[PDB]
Design brief:
The structure holds two protein chains of two kinds.
Chain A (H helix, E strand, L loop, with lengths): L2 E7 L5 E7 L4 H12 L14 E6 L5 E3 L7 H4 L5 E6 L4 H14 L4 H4 L4 H23 L2 H8 L12 E8 L5 E7 L4 H13 L5 E5 L4 E3 L9 H9 L4 E6 H9 L9 E10 L8 E10 L2 E2 L4 E2 L3 E2 L5 E11 L8 E9 L3 E9 L10 E6 L1 E2 L26 E6 L12 H9 L4 H9 L6 H9 L1 H7 L4 H7 L5 H12 L6 H7 L7 H11 L4 H6 L1 H7 L9 H12 L1 H12 L5 H16 L2 H30 L2 H13 L1 H6 L3 E2 L7 E2 L1 E2 L5 E2 L7 E6 L8 E8 L4 H19 L11 E5 L2 E5 L4 E3 H4 L4 H9 L5 H22 L9 E4 L4 E3 L17 H7 L7 H20 L1 H11 L10 H10 L6 H23 L4
Helix pairs in contact in A: 3-22, 3-23, 5-20, 5-22, 6-9, 10-15, 16-17, 19-32, 20-21, 21-22, 23-24, 26-29, 29-31, 31-34, 32-33
Chain B lengths: L5 H68 L5 H47 L2 H20 L4 H7 L2
Helix pairs in contact in B: 1-2, 1-3, 1-4
The chains are: A alpha+beta, B mainly alpha.
The structure holds the ligand O=C(C1CC1)N1CCC[C@]12C(=O)Nc1ccc(-c3ccc4nccnc4c3)cc12.
The ligand O=C(C1CC1)N1CCC[C@]12C(=O)Nc1ccc(-c3ccc4nccnc4c3)cc12 binds next to strand 29 and strand 30 of chain A.
Chain lengths: 930, 160
């Protein structure tokens, strides 16, 4: 029901308990409280209502001063209905942000303090300072810079000389100007024209794509802008708005290590809260690692008897001296259960801490449970270094690092490495052969190591090969390798992407990789943002270069920060990254107060949609669809719901405004998880006046995102070389635990639906009558090619009429990418009914059909040229632990799909055969129906 | 020096594969419960923190009531204002006990769900040997049939 009894604690010590409406804002609750407090003792002592602020305990267990009193008690969602009156005192700005961050990032800030961890304490101090400075600095500079930050340009991958008409208006005025300008006119010239036409000075304006935060500015012609290019293509008139600089200011405003030759050792002491077979015995297998490489042979404990609290009190000694241990040395445990084999659990530990100090004394590791995979390896060196946050219930291994020296010891500084690393026709042929044309063989490894000065001089791109041949168990070899690395020439982006892989743990390698990624444009960095976030799971320490780099780009570009926020926020349920991701989101937030407000609004919409979908899920199983639909409308229409779901920036595109929910057009889909189909209005021109979002809850959307990201990357690579295959790379955004959003492509239907012989061909006639049909067949042709190559290369099977869609424009696109990388080889696939439409209804139309074959072939050719980029991006995504992208074989599938082990012509000849066979297979499939 | 028929080994491949797929689905169900239970325990631990923080402000209010009342309440001939102040303070004290009672109730749930967590992980760790043995066995039989030169399409139909 509506009302809730609320406990009120007054600053005099007096206590009131009366009921209030869940829907009542805190301002309304102040008045009712004062009205009742006057009939209670010590009233006269109190100051006025406005002299106090309500304090509650929110859902994240923190105290929150509720400064915004236009908020409903039900929105505030305090732990128990308890409100305390306190003074408005001290830094109210600091107290409000700290409270908002906690709610926004999911995790409460207090949970960072509770750790009593210097490494967390130093990360928060250093990174929050850096983000606050960058945001203060940002507040100084001029509306243009701030517009570049807030609303960076959406350009066609250009970054035809026709002329067309453009509707223009001014800010706060119903009247408008239509007039022709050139496709190649820069945007200032459009501004000057509407200024003179207003009168019948212009650099203190900008052009807003209206109903949107998409602005047109800078030295770029009209056709290079996505809004224009989109408008040109459809033949629709762009609609703009002139906006005065002052209106943009309105928005802006509101002992040495190498001396220790004694071998490295631990005391294994005790296990804890172990859950195992009483009949069996327990073993702890231990090993040292640097990336994937064993630094020495593994060593085991004795077989102690299975119990909750097993005790070893054993010493484990390793075939390596302390002086040999590289910076990123990693001690890796697994608790095994044996008779007289069961991996129980595992835990890894860095030997040097975040300040470079060799660790000494008792350390208590809270283990992660082992999963059985195909590889079935003994230890799990790729695993996280962070301790399991379930510290009360989770298994644990107590061990003791020994006191190796009277004074504490650090890994040597850079200068001391340069010192040790300074002092050191025929063979060119064996090296050339080995490098030029992936796993090397130990005979090759010692040659590459010998001719390593030759690799830096003649094969700079082979740095990665050289780093693996290096013997990281020998400090001499490490010192020599790092000496070269400091003088190594800058590698291109493609090479640097490879160096972010787990095989390269050393901080000087990550540093060097990031140095070479600093040349990324914001556009290109956007294409790899998903892979760069997953790579953080391989990081050892919290303060790392890749984190600083990502916060630098997030603070300088608001779009990058938006998608950085959501990639991190959607994994805050995941215990292994919650802490790391939480700290980055706190720092991000402190450098991004404006966007905090946008993300707060988006977070509450999603919270309401989760609650809404959970209602619809239940009802579906209780009652038929039309009355569930009408109950969903009733629930949405409630003041709180409707306000939460209205007037927010799209999480899918912050420049898009989801303004007015269209309740009667809202529904849900008949899929398992009953995903909600939410419709919205806006102040846009035409097609974009109406927009839709699918809120999905219960499925993993990460597979679809990766797939759509890769189709988006393919489209850019294709468009970059002057081929537009009319793709539909719709937005997909994970937002939470098995939760995210999908952008509805409107004026589209599934092929099954439209087929209710020339049923597609008719549907295109009815949507493109008369002289529009030739365009619609070309849209279909070009898109069909693109999605034929795309699904082939990625290995996406299970493609049918229920998961393939046509746009009224004619464009084909795919949905619900469940599978990829074969999860046997998926053949290249031609569907007869698509060949039918391509041929213009004719049995035989060679002219057209060859053009479709070239589109497919040109497309397949452009992806092979960029195939290493696909491999490197896929290699980093292994960090995400998707079922279908686990291992070298899943990577191998792309090398074979793109045929990267074959010459360009050989590849193109093999593709042709597969093409031809798929055409012959096209006939035999269609012949079997009723 | 270097230390049965195909249809029979193919039958056992089919069996062992079926047993393996079944034991994978079983383990998978437990790993949902393990993950779900880990998310619930964590939520209960933060809710316990939320109780503690709620009680902390009630005990500050008591402290406030006793300090702020005393230095005032010497003004006695209103024995009437005094009983109102005390009864109001007894009303506050009475409400802490309800909150304490609720926090204790939640502490008992978590004690139970901590034990469920430990059982899931126990049952998970007694299924792993079966699962792993059943995978390695499945793979031994594939390797044998491939060596014997059995065609991929006969293997495919035994794996389904
Ligand atoms: O089910 C509905 C109504 C209940 C909401 N509808 C309304 C139009 C046709 C249809 C339909 O009957 N089946 C179906 C399947 C998929 C999409 C669809 C449409 C657009 C997308 N865009 C991106 C990603 N996925 C998309 C998926 C749309 C539909």
């Amino acid at each position: 029901n509506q009302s809730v009894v609320v406990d009120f604690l007054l600053p005099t010590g007096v206590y009131l308990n009366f009921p209030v409406s869940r829907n009542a804002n805190l301002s309304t609750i102040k008045q009712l409280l004062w009205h009742r407090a006057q009939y209670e003792p010590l009233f006269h002592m109190l100051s006025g209502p406005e002299a106090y602020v309500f304090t509650c305990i929110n859902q994240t267990a923190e105290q929150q001063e509720l400064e915004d009193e236009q908020r409903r008690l039900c929105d505030v969602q305090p732990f128990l209905p308890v409100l305390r009156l306190v003074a408005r005192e001290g830094d109210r700005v600091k107290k409000l942000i700290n409270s908002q961050i906690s709610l926004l990032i999911g995790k409460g800030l207090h949970e960072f303090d509770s750790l009593c961890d210097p490494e967390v304490n130093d990360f928060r101090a250093k990174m929050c300072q850096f983000c606050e400075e960058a945001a203060a600095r940002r507040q100084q500079l001029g509306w243009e810079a701030w517009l570049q930050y807030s609303f960076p340009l959406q350009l066609e991958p250009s970054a035809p000389n026709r002329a067309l008409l453009v509707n223009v208006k001014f800010e706060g005025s119903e009247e408008s100007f239509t007039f022709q300008v050139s496709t190649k006119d820069v945007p200032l010239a459009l501004m000057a024209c509407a200024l003179r036409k207003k009168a019948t000075q212009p650099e203190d304006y900008t052009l807003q794509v209206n109903g949107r935060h998409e602005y047109l500015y800078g030295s770029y012609p009209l056709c290079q802008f996505q809004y224009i290019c989109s408008c040109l293509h459809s033949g629709l008139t762009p609609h703009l708005t002139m906006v005065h600089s002052s209106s943009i200011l309105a928005m802006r405003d509101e002992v040495s290590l190498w001396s220790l030759e004694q071998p490295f050792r631990i005391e294994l002491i005790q296990g804890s809260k172990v859950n195992a077979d009483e009949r069996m015995k327990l073993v702890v297998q231990a090993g040292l690692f640097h990336g994937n490489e064993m630094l020495c042979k593994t060593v085991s404990s004795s077989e102690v008897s299975v119990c909750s609290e097993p005790v070893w009190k054993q010493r484990l000694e390793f075939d390596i001296n302390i002086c040999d241990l590289p910076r990123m040395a990693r001690l890796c445990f697994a608790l095994y259960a044996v008779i007289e084999d069961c991996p129980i659990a595992w835990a890894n530990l860095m030997l040097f801490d975040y300040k470079d100090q060799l660790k000494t004394g008792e350390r208590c590791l809270y283990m992660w449970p082992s999963v059985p995979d195909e590889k079935g390896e003994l230890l799990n060196p790729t695993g996280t270094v962070r301790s399991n946050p379930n510290t009360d219930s989770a298994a644990a291994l107590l061990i003791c690092l020994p006191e190796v020296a009277p004074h504490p010891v650090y890994y040597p500084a850079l200068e001391k490495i340069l010192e040790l690393g300074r002092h050191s026709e025929e063979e060119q042929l064996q090296l050339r052969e080995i490098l030029e044309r992936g796993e090397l063989y130990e005979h090759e490894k010692d040659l590459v190591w010998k001719l390593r000065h030759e690799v830096q001089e003649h094969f700079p791109e082979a740095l990665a090969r050289l780093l693996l041949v290096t013997k990281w168990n020998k400090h001499e070899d490490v010192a020599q390798m790092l000496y070269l690395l400091c003088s190594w020439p800058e590698l291109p982006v493609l090479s640097a992407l490879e160096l972010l892989d787990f095989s390269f743990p050393d901080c000087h390698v990550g540093s060097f990789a990031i140095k070479s990624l600093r040349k990324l444009t914001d556009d290109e960095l956007f294409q790899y943002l998903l892979q760069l976030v997953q790579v953080l799971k391989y990081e050892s320490y919290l303060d790392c270069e890749l984190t600083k780099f990502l916060l630098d780009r997030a603070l300088a570009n608001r779009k990058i920060g938006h998608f950085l926020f959501w990639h991190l926020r959607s994994e805050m349920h995941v215990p292994s990254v919650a802490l790391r991701f939480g700290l980055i989101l706190e720092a991000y937030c402190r450098g991004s107060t404006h966007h905090m407000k946008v993300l707060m609004k988006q977070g509450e919409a999603l919270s309401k949609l989760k609650a809404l979908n959970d209602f619809v899920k239940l009802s579906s199983q209780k009652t038929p669809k039309p009355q569930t639909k009408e109950l969903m409308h009733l629930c949405m229409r409630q003041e709180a719901y409707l306000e939460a779901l209205s007037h927010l920036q799209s999480p899918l595109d912050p420049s898009t405004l989801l303004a007015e929910v269209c309740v009667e057009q809202c529904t849900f889909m008949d899929s398992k998880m009953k995903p909600l189909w939410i419709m919205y209005s806006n102040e846009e021109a035409g097609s974009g006046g109406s927009v839709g979002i699918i809120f999905k809850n219960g499925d993993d959307l990460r597979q679809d995102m990766l797939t759509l990201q890769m189709i988006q990357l393919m489209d850019v690579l294709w468009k970059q070389e002057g081929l537009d295959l009319r793709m539909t790379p719709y937005g997909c955004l994970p937002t939470g635990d098995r939760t995210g959003l999908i952008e509805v492509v409107l004026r589209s239907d599934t092929i099954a639906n439209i087929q209710l012989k020339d049923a597609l061909l008719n549907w295109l006639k009815s949507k493109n009558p008369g002289e529009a049909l030739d365009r619609a067949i070309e849209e279909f042709t070009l898109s069909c090619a693109g999605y034929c190559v795309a699904t082939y290369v990625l290995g996406i099977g299970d493609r049918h009429s229920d998961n393939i869609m046509i746009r009224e424009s004619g464009q084909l696109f795919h949905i619900d990418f469940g599978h990829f990388l074969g999860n046997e080889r998926v053949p290249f696939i031609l569907t007869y009914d698509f060949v039918h439409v391509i041929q213009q209804g004719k049995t035989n139309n060679s002219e057209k059909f060859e053009r479709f074959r070239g589109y497919c072939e040109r497309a397949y050719t452009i992806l092979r040229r960029h195939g290493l980029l696909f491999l490197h991006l896929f290699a980093l995504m292994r960090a995400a632990g998707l079922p279908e992208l686990s291992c070298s074989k899943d990577i191998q599938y792309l090398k074979d799909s793109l045929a990267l082990g074959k010459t360009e012509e050989e590849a193109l000849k093999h593709f042709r055969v597969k093409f031809n066979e798929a055409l012959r297979e096209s006939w035999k499939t269609k012949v079997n129906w009723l | 020096q270097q230390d049965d028929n195909i249809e029979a080994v193919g039958k056992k491949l089919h069996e062992y594969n079926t047993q393996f797929q079944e034991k994978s689905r079983e383990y998978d169900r437990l790993y949902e419960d393990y993950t779900r239970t880990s998310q619930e325990i964590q939520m209960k631990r933060t809710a316990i923190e939320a109780f503690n923080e709620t009680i902390k402000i009630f005990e500050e209010q008591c402290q406030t009531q006793e300090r702020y009342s005393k230095e005032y309440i010497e003004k006695f001939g209103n024995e009437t204002e005094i009983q109102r102040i005390m009864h109001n303070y007894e009303k506050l004290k009475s409400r802490i006990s309800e909150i304490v009672d609720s926090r204790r109730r939640l502490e008992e749930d978590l004690k139970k769900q901590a034990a469920e967590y430990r059982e899931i992980d126990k049952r998970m760790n007694s299924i792993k040997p079966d699962l792993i043995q059943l995978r390695k066995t499945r793979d031994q039989y594939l390797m044998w049939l491939t060596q014997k030169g059995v065609r991929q399409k006969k293997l495919n139909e035994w794996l389904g």
